[PDB]
Amino acid sequence: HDIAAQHLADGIAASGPAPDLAAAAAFLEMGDRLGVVAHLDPDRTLETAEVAAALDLPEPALVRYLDAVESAGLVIREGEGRYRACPDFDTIRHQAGYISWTMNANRPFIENARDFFTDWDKAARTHVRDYREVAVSSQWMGSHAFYPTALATIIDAAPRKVVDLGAGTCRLLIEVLGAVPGSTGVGLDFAADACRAAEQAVAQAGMTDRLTVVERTIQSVATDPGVLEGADVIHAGFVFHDMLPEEEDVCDQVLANCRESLAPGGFLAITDAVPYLRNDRERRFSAAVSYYHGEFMRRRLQSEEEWVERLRGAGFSDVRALTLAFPTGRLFLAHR
Amino acid sequence: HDIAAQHLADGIAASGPAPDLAAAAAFLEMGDRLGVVAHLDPDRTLETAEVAAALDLPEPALVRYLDAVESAGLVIREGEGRYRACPDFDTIRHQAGYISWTMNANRPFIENARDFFTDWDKAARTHVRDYREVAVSSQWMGSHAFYPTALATIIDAAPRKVVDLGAGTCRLLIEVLGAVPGSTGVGLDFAADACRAAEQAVAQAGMTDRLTVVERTIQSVATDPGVLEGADVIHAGFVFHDMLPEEEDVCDQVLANCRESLAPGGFLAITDAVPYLRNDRERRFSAAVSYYHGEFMRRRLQSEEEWVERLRGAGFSDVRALTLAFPTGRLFLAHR
Numbered sequence: 306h307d308i309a310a311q312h313l314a315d316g317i318a319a320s321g322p323a324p325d326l327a328a329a330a331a332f333l334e335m336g337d338r339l340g341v342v343a344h345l346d347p348d349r350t351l352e353t354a355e356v357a358a359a360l361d362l363p364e365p366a367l368v369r370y371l372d373a374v375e376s377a378g379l380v381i382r383e384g385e386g387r388y389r390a391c392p393d394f395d396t397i398r399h400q401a402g403y404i405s406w407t408m409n410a411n412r413p414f415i416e417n418a419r420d421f422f423t424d425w426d427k428a429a430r431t432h433v434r435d436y437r438e439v440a441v442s443s444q445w446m447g448s449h450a451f452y453p454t455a456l457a458t459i460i461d462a463a464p465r466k467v468v469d470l471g472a473g474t475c476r477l478l479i480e481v482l483g484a485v486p487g488s489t490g491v492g493l494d495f496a497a498d499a500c501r502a503a504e505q506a507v508a509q510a511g512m513t514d515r516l517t518v519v520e521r522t523i524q525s526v527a528t529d530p531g532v533l534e535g536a537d538v539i540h541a542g543f544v545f546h547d548m549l550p551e552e553e554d555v556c557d558q559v560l561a562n563c564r565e566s567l568a569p570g571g572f573l574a575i576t577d578a579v580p581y582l583r584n585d586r587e588r589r590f591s592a593a594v595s596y597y598h599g600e601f602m603r604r605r606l607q608s609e610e611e612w613v614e615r616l617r618g619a620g621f622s623d624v625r626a627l628t629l630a631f632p633t634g635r636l637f638l639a640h641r
Numbered sequence: 642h643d644i645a646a647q648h649l650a651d652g653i654a655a656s657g658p659a660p661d662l663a664a665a666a667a668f669l670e671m672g673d674r675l676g677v678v679a680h681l682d683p684d685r686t687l688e689t690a691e692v693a694a695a696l697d698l699p700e701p702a703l704v705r706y707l708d709a710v711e712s713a714g715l716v717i718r719e720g721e722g723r724y725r726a727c728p729d730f731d732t733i734r735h736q737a738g739y740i741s742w743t744m745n746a747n748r749p750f751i752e753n754a755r756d757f758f759t760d761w762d763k764a765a766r767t768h769v770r771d772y773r774e775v776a777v778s779s780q781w782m783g784s785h786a787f788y789p790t791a792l793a794t795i796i797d798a799a800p801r802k803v804v805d806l807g808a809g810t811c812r813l814l815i816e817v818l819g820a821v822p823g824s825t826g827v828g829l830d831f832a833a834d835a836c837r838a839a840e841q842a843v844a845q846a847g848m849t850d851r852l853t854v855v856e857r858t859i860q861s862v863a864t865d866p867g868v869l870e871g872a873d874v875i876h877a878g879f880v881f882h883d884m885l886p887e888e889e890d891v892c893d894q895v896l897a898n899c900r901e902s903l904a905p906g907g908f909l910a911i912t913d914a915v916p917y918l919r920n921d922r923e924r925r926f927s928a929a930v931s932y933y934h935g936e937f938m939r940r941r942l943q944s945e946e947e948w949v950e951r952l953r954g955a956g957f958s959d960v961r962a963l964t965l966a967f968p969t970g971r972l973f974l975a976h977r
């Protein structure tokens with residue numbers, strides 16, 4: 306009893322927040338794969354009869370899942386068959402994003418490291434990340450750690466035209482056009498699924514005449530930069546590093562074309578990951594990001610000094626670097 | 642700058658310890674699968690030339706991994722080719738155990754929940770947990786949250802004979818015999834790999850005459866309880882629930898045979914998971930443990946009241962329940 310009480314207090318201190326985070330991440334990744342997490346919100350209820358039909362799940366199984374997440378404190382049962390997310394659900398979901406990204410999205414690298422160390426080329430084509438999991442976990446991490454800064458910076462500039470390179474479902478552009486009256490936008494993406502999803506979301510928002518979705522590569526902007534002309538802001542979120550070190554010349558031409566294409570006073574806003582930071586807050590997650598990129602994906606992450614030298618080499622007059630809450634994430638504002 | 646500073650502070654608060662834990666868990670699961678984590682300790686160095694040869698890894702690849710974990714703050718480079726774990730490595734490894742257990746060991750349940758909801762029997766035989774990952778993550782969780790209480794309780798009783806049901810590599814029995822002079826022990830396990838590993842560890846400790854390793858089932862103790870006779874302490878860590886609800890009668894006979902077999906003043910010490918607790922500290926991880934057991938594995942977790950009624954039904958005169966730091970974990974001491 307006395308020995309057990311001391312071990313209890315010691316063990317609680319040692320475990321800290323890891324049981325809570327471990328549980329949240331597993332429930333939310335499972336729920337997201339089922340399509341349930343998208344219907345969970347702190348300001349409205351999920352009706353199980355309707356959601357089970359929408360997701361093609363047996364309602365008794367959905368109810369048992371929701372009762373387990375209710376017991377966990379992640380949702381509140383309002384009436385029979387209705388559940389609301391807990392008040393701080395979005396922060397819990399944000400935190401879970403880091404765990405999902407390292408442990409789920411990058412799982413092929415965790416499990417097959419011996420293969421990548423022996424024959425990288427064979428391992429890289431065999432052990433491939435599920436890009437739906439990469440995207441969702443990135444979005445959850447971004448919600449509170451990089452997306453708000455990029456959003457507010459673009460809105461505060463009061464732009465007439467915004468171009469997003471690697472726009473995906475054009476969520477950022479739709480929200481910028483909603484806040485800046487009279488603004489136009491171009492959402493460039495090389496995936497058919499993403500451009501079709503962006504098209505339906507643009508139509509739903511009622512801004513098809515203002516927001517144009519184009520299915521093409523960022524690399525095609527080096528030879529064909531017409532879509533960038535007159536842009537007040539050009540945004541590129543965690544995309545440029547995928548062109549380095551193999552497509553460096555094409556990357557530099559895309560950057561020089563961005564500078565020359567901007568309207569006076571315009572800027573190119575790049576969010577990207579800098580390698581292996583030493584400061585206490587950032588170093589652990591910085592090393593995970595840097596190692597997965599360098600060792601497993603062979604994509605070159607640039608320091609702030611490298612990014613500034615590359616951006617000034619593309620003709621930009623001044624470059625500002627801003628620290629994001631996302632560890633190792635930096636926002637570079639390259640002024641024409 | 643002002644907007645970015647506010648988003649920085651907000652984002653740091655929202656992310657909290659999740660980037661650090663996410664990074665630690667991924668590096669340590671990757672390192673454990675490579676066999677590197679076993680050579681990491683805060684009180685000694687890992688020599689890369691020797692460890693790379695022992696693990697059959699290219700030394701340059703091992704060095705790059707260790708330099709990434711050094712950048713992360715998990716290890717310290719002492720000289721060239723020598724690395725020591727950070728001072729608090731064992732607490733970090735403990736916390737990582739929860740993430741590994743929910744996100745790695747139980748990954749089949751996360752990824753294939755729709756299958757378990759549609760055809761449980763087909764899913765249960767198709768989507769199977771890697772039991773090496775279940776064991777290692779359980780051990781990391783146990784290090785600071787259940788193993789010390791069980792260890793100290795057995796040692797304080799000053800037993801002449803201890804039996805461990807589901808002993809594995811007999812780590813607990815070896816440590817109890819080391820602290821209690823003249824004590825004997827029986828390590829029962831139904832796996833050949835575990836019994837062979839236990840045999841080599843028992844021989845290494847120099848206690849082959851005192852510790853006997855037996856390859857047989859816990860269920861065989863219901864018909865053949867001879868090995869339990871005269872035991873002062875019988876230990877069963879997270880094993881009894883695997884016999885419920887299908888082998889209930891056999892479980893009850895194993896428990897009644899434990900009571901009748903104990904020497905006077907002896908006790909049966911069971912550590913197990915109780916279902917779906919509501920208290921704030923335990924509820925989230927309790928729900929994850931309870932849901933993986935109930936929904937995915939169909940194993941019956943018993944409340945404290947159920948465990949007490951079952952143990953008193955087996956003839957035990959008094960039962961005490963002790964809260965462990967492991968959320969939802971309870972230690973039941975059933976006195977003869």
Ligand SMILES: C[S@@+](CC[C@H](N)C(=O)[O-])C[C@H]1O[C@@H](n2cnc3c(N)ncnc32)[C@H](O)[C@@H]1O
Pocket residue numbers: 439470471472473474493494495496499521522523524542543544547
């Ligand atoms: C914003 S990027 C962020 C993740 C990044 N691709 C990575 O893993 O390093 C993801 C989105 O950009 C798109 N995308 C990726 N590479 C692209 C490229 N070179 N040109 C155009 N779109 C691209 C993808 O289709 C997806 O919608």
Ligand SMILES: C[S@@+](CC[C@H](N)C(=O)[O-])C[C@H]1O[C@@H](n2cnc3c(N)ncnc32)[C@H](O)[C@@H]1O
Pocket residue numbers: 775806807808809810829830831832835857858859860878879880883
């Ligand atoms: C201590 S149990 C804890 C985990 C538990 N099996 C679970 O997943 O619910 C794991 C160890 O007990 C052994 N074991 C499991 N079931 C057993 C049984 N019925 N009889 C004997 N040993 C058993 C395994 O071989 C392993 O070494």
Ligand SMILES: CC(C)CC(=O)C(=O)O
Pocket residue numbers: 439443446543578594
């Ligand atoms: C750094 C993350 C936001 C996304 C990323 O770059 C990746 O997962 O490859």
Ligand SMILES: CC(C)CC(=O)C(=O)O
Pocket residue numbers: 775779782879914930
């Ligand atoms: C509760 C854990 C310690 C182990 C367990 O019961 C399992 O993983 O099945």
Ligand SMILES: [Cl-]
Pocket residue numbers: none
């Ligand atoms: Cl000019």
Ligand SMILES: [Cl-]
Pocket residue numbers: none
């Ligand atoms: Cl009696």
Ligand SMILES: [Zn+2]
Pocket residue numbers: 543546598604
């Ligand atoms: Zn990337």
Ligand SMILES: [Zn+2]
Pocket residue numbers: 879882934940
């Ligand atoms: Zn279990």
